[PDB]
Structure 1
Amino acid sequence: PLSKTWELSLYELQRTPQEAITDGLEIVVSPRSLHSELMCPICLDMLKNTMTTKECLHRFCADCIITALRSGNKECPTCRKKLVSKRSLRPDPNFDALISKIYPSRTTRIKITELNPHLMCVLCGGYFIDATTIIECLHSFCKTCIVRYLETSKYCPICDVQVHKTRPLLNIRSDKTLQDIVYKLVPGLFKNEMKRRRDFYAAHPS
């Protein structure tokens, strides 16, 4: 049920932000390879005018997925969930902005401060951890941050559009693709977060 899906763990109830790297670090971008999270799975090029399925948060070039639906096959090409029409998609300017910085229409080093705005939760001011996306407007937050926020508001923290008339948790989804590209881009973030969890569970055994 919904109550179990978004119940926060003992760790999650006390978690604190993963603070941004602001020291001048540059990350390495390889020539002639893509991060697969930034690749359209239909045309196999970097995403162009990214559109994202509301139900399953899968990304495609706008033209690729609109054309795919005109085959008559009304499903998501990535997971095969039903996809009624292009109104089941939303524009993803965050992915577009990330791509424009990592793959400038082609440098080998990128300042992580240039990427940070696209990888950070505005509620805690740190990097996304268990990124979770409001499906109507495609704004994203840490799981714990948005779950706690929606206990006292039914409106998006960023754009203020009502998430749901009565139960906002119905209209959020875990965003694996966003969290995966965050962990791939931010050095040490996955390692640091898993260490925090291990340290917590060791201090609170059961």
Structure 2
Amino acid sequence: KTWELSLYELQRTPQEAITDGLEIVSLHSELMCPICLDMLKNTMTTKECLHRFCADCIITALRSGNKECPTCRKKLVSKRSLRPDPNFDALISKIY
């Protein structure tokens, strides 16, 4: 992108936190690894495309010699094309 901000964006203000004890009760297409179709464990995230996979799953795909992102087929050179996502794991720890 150019990362240009719209008129609305240029003046937007924060969405403040909900700080009451409101509890929460669908997240499959977000916290699920697309390889094993299980819930993400030790999430690894592609740098170029921000697609998330279990560490063991994506390392396995790459080790097989397929150097494509399983989600979007973008070139992945190696595991240095990937970052650990501890903050995604942490979210998953609390929700499940």
Question: Is TM > 0.5 for Structure 1 vs Structure 2?
Answer: yes
Deviation per CA, 1:56-85: give whole Å up to 9, x if none.
000000000000001111010000000110
Question: Where does structure 1 differ by over 4 angstroms across 4 or more consecutive aligned residues?
Answer: none
Q: Secondary structure at the match of 2:50?
A: coil
Unmatched tracts of structure 1, length 5 or more? 28-32, 104-206
Query: How large is the Cα RMSD of the aligned pairs?
Result: 1.2
**Following TM superposition, by how much is the alpha carbon of 1:45 offset from its aligned partner in structure 2, in angstroms?**
1.0
**Residues 146-190 of structure 1, C-alpha deviation per residue, up to 9 Å, x if partnerless?**
xxxxxxxxxxxxxxxxxxxxxxxxxxxxxxxxxxxxxxxxxxxxx
Question: What is the deviation of 1:86?
Answer: 0.5
The count of residues paired between Structure 1 and Structure 2 equals: 95
The structure with the largest helix share of the pair is 1
Deviations 1:114-173 (A, max 9, x none): xxxxxxxxxxxxxxxxxxxxxxxxxxxxxxxxxxxxxxxxxxxxxxxxxxxxxxxxxxxx
Between the two proteins, what is the percent identity of the paired residues?
100
In structure 1, C-alpha distance between the alignment counterparts of 2:47 and 2:69, rounded to whole Å: 11
Q: Name the SS for the 2:53 alignment partner.
A: strand
Distance 2:73 2:11 in 1: 37
Q: Give TM-score, length-normalised by structure 2.
A: 0.94
Please, which of 56, 75, 83 is the counterpart of residue 49 of structure 2? 56
What's the CA shift for 1:34?
A: 4.8
Distance in 1, matches of 2:20 and 2:2, equals 37
